[PDB]
């Protein structure tokens, strides 16, 4: 009935997604333009995609061949925001990564190729750009064996030259080592003698289900040799569609984009059954939600359909649609996923332009959450500085390019909040006075902050004896001291607090529990002035993996990095070392592994250790504080 969706793992800008556009011509026409060099249609979809030389997100197009459906989508391999391509693995169990012809498969694709093993679905390599000089017709293909780390072998191979043979092979005599692993095929090898290669295709069909080796492929699509006959193998090599219709219908959402003409359309594949048009269905919200409209995503143009087939995937409008929401409930599938292993890939500010027009840009930030699911943001800072969870360099250009088209706003930020945690330098005597020298409230206490070891945090104790300590009013002294830990004299947040309060004379007829709370904040800004200020910065550790041959080049980055050297151990050809550098400069460390690593760089860390301290000048971030009672009286204390 149906057919599994084809892959599109064009890692390292392999342009294998552009080879998919050639597949639409092979499945054509009977009426189509046939594609063109550059951009170019090929289901480009959103504006400013092909103009950028690569799509901002993975697409999809309708297709068919061999009397079977053959949906596919590409590429998602650019950059940079590759986690989004990880959401497309749920769209189809198939794979068809295009290894590069230059030194074997690109190393950045090896990360997407190793991620395919976690999918548990089969995949196959393809000789993209075979009709080019310097191609590894016999040398670079061996590099796919060392990078595959298995025993996959091509079903055919040729060298050219104008010739592009493919069916002439392949793997005579020595080929068929994968059959040796089959419990049935290994018994036929014990019998000896020659046998038909179709006989070994049954045992290879069992191993293909386990995805034990990438199916063979060769020939660049530009040469128009083998780019069509190799596509026939995707029809037979691909796993059959799990047709049924027995009900009840079930599925799950896959991806969605806020098209300007949409304005919304959360497409999702049907895991089982089928949904009749204009009929209610179950959802994760626990309420009724009929699909008022739905259509298959044809490569040449959108097309409506009265009901999706079982196992099909097609866009459909809705009032709401949470990501990964059950169409049943519920889907029963399990797999591993990650956003390229990075909780926050170098957050950058993006404050919108204009004192008021920037605010409408904030709502477009909710529209970034309607796009790729690997995205987050929150205005934790008191200035409400933007802090997007998106990472990577070129991936930010799509988020910035989207602001120039989908919206009308833009911003430039990168330094972020300094994250200072200033601490007092030393303990000193202090007191709020007694009686009314004096200013409100008349209640006072003599704060006596003291130094503390770094990372100990704030502390306080009720030194005063009862009942002058106050069983209830004394607690405001601590709650009022906390108000003075929100910022030091330089505006840096309080750290290493140790205010052991002692003397606290007070008059009963006029004393109040807010009166002590108010004089308590002045004890913390006066006792902090005797501290002389002590700026400190976090220095969380940041482990990273680099190749040993480049590991000597990573020691040069050490002198530029503010971090000090740390223990590390090699791991075969891979290498790693335990660093520890400050967060103010840690965001620039990612740029260093993308260059000196040669693309092999990888790292990870997390905030820790409040202690730090560094020069110079002891700059502080204003301002603290405002919009509080009796704040103008703290200005009188300066003189």
């Amino acid at each position: 009935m149906k057919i599994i969706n084809i892959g599109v793992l064009a890692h390292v800008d392999a342009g294998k997604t552009t080879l998919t556009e050639s597949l639409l011509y092979n499945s054509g026409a009977i009426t189509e333009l046939g594609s063109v060099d550059k951009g170019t249609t090929r289901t480009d979809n959103t504006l400013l995609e092909r103009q950028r030389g690569i799509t901002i997100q993975t697409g999809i197009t309708s297709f068919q061949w061999e009397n079977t459906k053959v949906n596919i989508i590409d590429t998602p391999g650019h950059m940079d925001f590759l986690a989004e391509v990880y959401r497309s693995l749920s769209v189809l169990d198939g794979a068809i990564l295009l290894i590069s012809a230059k030194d074997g498969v690109q190393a950045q694709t090896r990360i997407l190729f190793h991620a395919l093993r976690k999918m548990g679905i089969p995949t196959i390599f393809f000789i993209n750009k075979i009709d080019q000089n310097g191609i590894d017709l016999s040398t670079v293909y061996q590099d796919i064996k060392e990078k595959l780390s298995a025993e996959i072998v091509i079903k055919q191979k040729v060298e050219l030259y104008p010739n592009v043979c493919v069916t002439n092979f392949t793997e005579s005599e020595q080929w068929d080592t994968v059959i040796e692993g089959n419990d049935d095929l290994l018994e036929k090898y014990m019998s000896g003698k020659s046998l038909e290669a179709l006989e070994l295709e049954q045992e290879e069909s069992i191993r293909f289900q386990n995805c034990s080796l990438f199916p063979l492929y060769h020939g660049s699509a530009k040469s128009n040799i083998g780019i069509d006959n190799l596509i026939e193998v995707i029809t037979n090599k691909f796993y059959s569609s799990t047709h049924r219709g027995p009900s009840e219908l079930c599925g799950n959402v896959f991806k969605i984009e806020y098209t300007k003409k949409r304005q919304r359309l959360a497409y999702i594949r049907l895991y089982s059954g089928v949904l009749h048009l204009r009929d209610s269905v179950r959802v994760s919200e626990k309420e009724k939600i009929k699909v008022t409209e739905m259509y298959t995503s044809i490569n040449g143009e959108l097309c409506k359909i009265d009901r999706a087939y079982s196992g099909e995937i097609v866009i459909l409008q809705n009032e709401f649609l949470k990501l990964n929401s059950v169409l049943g409930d519920t889907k029963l599938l399990p797999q591993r996923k990650k956003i390229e292993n990075p909780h926050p890939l170098l957050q950058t500010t993006v404050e919108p332009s204009k004192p008021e027009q920037r605010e409408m840009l904030l709502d477009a930030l909710l529209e970034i959450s309607d796009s790729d699911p690997l995205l987050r943001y929150y205005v934790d800072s008191t200035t409400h500085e933007i802090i997007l969870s998106f990472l990577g360099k070129v991936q930010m250009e799509v988020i910035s390019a989207l602001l120039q088209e989908k919206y009308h706003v833009e911003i430039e930020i990168t330094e972020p909040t300094v994250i200072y945690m200033e601490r007092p330098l030393k303990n000193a005597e202090y007191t709020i006075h007694i009686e009314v020298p004096p200013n409100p409230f008349w209640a006072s206490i003599g704060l006596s902050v003291s130094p503390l070891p770094l990372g100990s945090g704030m502390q306080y104790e009720s030194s005063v004896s009862l009942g002058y300590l106050n069983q209830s009013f004394q607690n405001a002294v601590m709650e009022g001291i906390r108000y003075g830990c929100e910022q030091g004299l330089y505006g840096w947040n309080v750290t290493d607090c140790k205010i052991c309060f002692k003397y606290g004379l007070y008059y009963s007829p006029v004393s109040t529990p807010a009166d002590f709370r108010m004089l308590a904040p002045i004890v913390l800004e006066q006792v902090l002035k005797k501290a002389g200020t002590e700026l400190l910065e976090p220095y969380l550790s940041f482990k990273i993996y680099a190749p040993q041959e480049y590991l000597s080049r990573a020691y040069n980055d050490a002198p530029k990095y503010c971090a000090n050297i740390v223990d590390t151990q090699l791991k075969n050809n891979e290498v790693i070392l335990s660093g520890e550098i400050p967060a103010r400069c840690i965001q620039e460390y990612r740029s260093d592994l993308t260059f000196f690593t040669n693309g092999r760089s990888v790292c990870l860390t997390e905030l820790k250790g409040y202690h730090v301290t560094t020069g110079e000048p002891v700059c502080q971030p204003r301002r603290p504080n405002s919009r509080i009672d009796k704040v103008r009286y703290m200005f009188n204390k300066i003189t």
Binding site: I565, V566, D567, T568, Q569, L570, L577
Partner: protein, 141 residues
């Protein structure tokens, strides 16, 4: 007798099982495991006194482990318990930090002779005693 390959003579006190703040990555710079420098490093340390920094050959080979032959601790750290003061140089000729004598330092010299290369014990006496002159120590002849 293969020449230079990867061997080095750097590790702190022998009683410090599995060091890391001192040596750390330097011993792990090759393919040798960090576990190799405590489970086997102490196999010869237990034979003699613990805590004495004794250099040892680390000729790494591709075959996982490596051959090694223990040597003799340096005379600099030897001039502590046997010299009383834990200090050394810094102020050599400017003032006398301490002094021993030839009757005792020569008596220790032949214990190190298994590693020293000398035609005669007297020739190896002043070459060791002359190292304490760099410390500002004045030997009592």
């Amino acid at each position: 007798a293969k020449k230079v390959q990867a061997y080095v003579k750097l590790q702190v006190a022998a009683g410090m099982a599995n060091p890391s703040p001192p040596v750390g990555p330097a011993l792990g710079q090759q393919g040798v495991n960090i576990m190799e420098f405590c489970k086997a490093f102490n196999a010869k340390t237990d034979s003699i006194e613990k805590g004495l920094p004794i250099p040892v050959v680390i000729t790494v080979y591709a075959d996982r482990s490596f051959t090694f032959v223990t040597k003799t601790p340096p005379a600099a750290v030897l001039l502590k318990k046997a010299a009383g003061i834990k200090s050394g140089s810094g102020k050599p000729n400017k003032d006398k930090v301490g002094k021993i004598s030839r009757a005792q330092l020569q008596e220790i010299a032949q214990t190190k002779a298994a590693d020293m290369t000398g035609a005669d014990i007297e020739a190896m006496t002043r070459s060791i005693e002359g190292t304490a002159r760099s410390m500002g120590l004045v030997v009592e002849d």
